[PDB]
Amino acid sequence: MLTEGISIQSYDGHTFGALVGSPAKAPAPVIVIAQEIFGVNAFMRETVSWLVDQGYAAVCPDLYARQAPGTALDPQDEAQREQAYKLWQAFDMEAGVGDLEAAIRYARHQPYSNGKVGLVGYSLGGALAFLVAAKGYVDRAVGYYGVGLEKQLNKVPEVKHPALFHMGGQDHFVPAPSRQLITEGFGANPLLQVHWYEEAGHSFARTSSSGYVASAAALANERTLDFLAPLQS
Questions:
Q1: Homologous superfamily assigned to 1-233
Q2: Residue pair 48/34 in contact by the 8 Å Cβ criterion
Q3: Is 233 helix (H, G, I), strand (E, B) or coil?
Q4: What are the beta bridge partners of residue 68?
């Protein structure tokens, strides 16, 4: 689902929609939410809703719009999971970072904006959150279980604003030696935080996932809120 009429333009000229939640009380910081591999779907709407309840405004951009506008896939449907994986495999990460940059700029200047912008990303969006943190576009970035973070560690010294990452210890995407590389690499930059959730794998914060772990989700989520709270004012 997207908010009808919302259109955001990327540096290269491409336009895309977004699901937008205005804040309960303005002004407020705006959180750009970077999707999982399923488009802008139920978990994204639930996340917009949660962040509104917590005193933010939120913008969730349609990152698959370069491939197919308005994709919103049910992660419990096998056929739709297959299409999600195809879209993720074809996804242009660089263009994704550009689209997120444009959504961050949009979020800075809405009439409800206090001028501070955060980013929270899950799965695909967690990978994008790290790349955005390296570019420095946001005041604070948060990623949940991005894939391939051990391949991006050369970017660690580029991070100049705080970023927080939540990783599942049982995530099959992240074997032990990758976890060790990430832990060591992140330790070199105190602006980065990474927490490991030993009893949780991928997608642990989404109730509809077979990987959902309530204790891990709750701890991660309260850490996220405490980390974003300084943006409020």
A1: Alpha/Beta hydrolase fold, catalytic domain (3.40.50.1820)
A2: no
A3: coil
A4: none
Phi and psi angles of residue 96, each rounded to the nearest 5 degrees, phi first: -65, -45
Count the neighbouring beta carbons within 10 Å of the beta carbon of residue 208: 15
Largest CA-CA distance found in the chain, in angstroms, rounded: 46
From 62, 139, 166, 202, active-site residue: 202
153, 217, 103, 86 alpha-carbon torsion, rounded to 10°: 70
The three-class DSSP label of residue 5 is coil
Q: Is 70 left (phi over 0), alpha (psi -120 to 50) or beta?
A: left
> Quick one: residue 96, left, alpha or beta (phi over 0 = left, psi -120 to 50 = alpha)?
alpha
Beta strands 8-9; 15-16: pairing state: antiparallel
| Active site annotation includes 99 | no
Which residues have C-beta within 8 Å of that of residue 216, sequence separation ≥ 6? 168, 197, 199, 200, 204, 205
Of residues 62, 99, 139, 171, which has the active-site annotation?
171
Nearest Cα to 124, choosing from 78, 73, 162? Answer: 73
State this model's resolution in angstroms.
Answer: 1.7
Comparing CA positions, the residue from 94, 147, 138, 93 lying closest to residue 120 is 138
Query: Using an 8 Å Cβ cutoff, are 186 and 179 in contact?
Result: no
DSSP string, 138-153: SSEEEEES-S-GGG-G
Active site residue 202: yes
Q: How far apart are CA 209 and CA 155, in angstroms?
A: 31
CA distances from residue 47 to 36, 58, 64, 136 in whole angstroms, order as listed: 12, 9, 18, 23
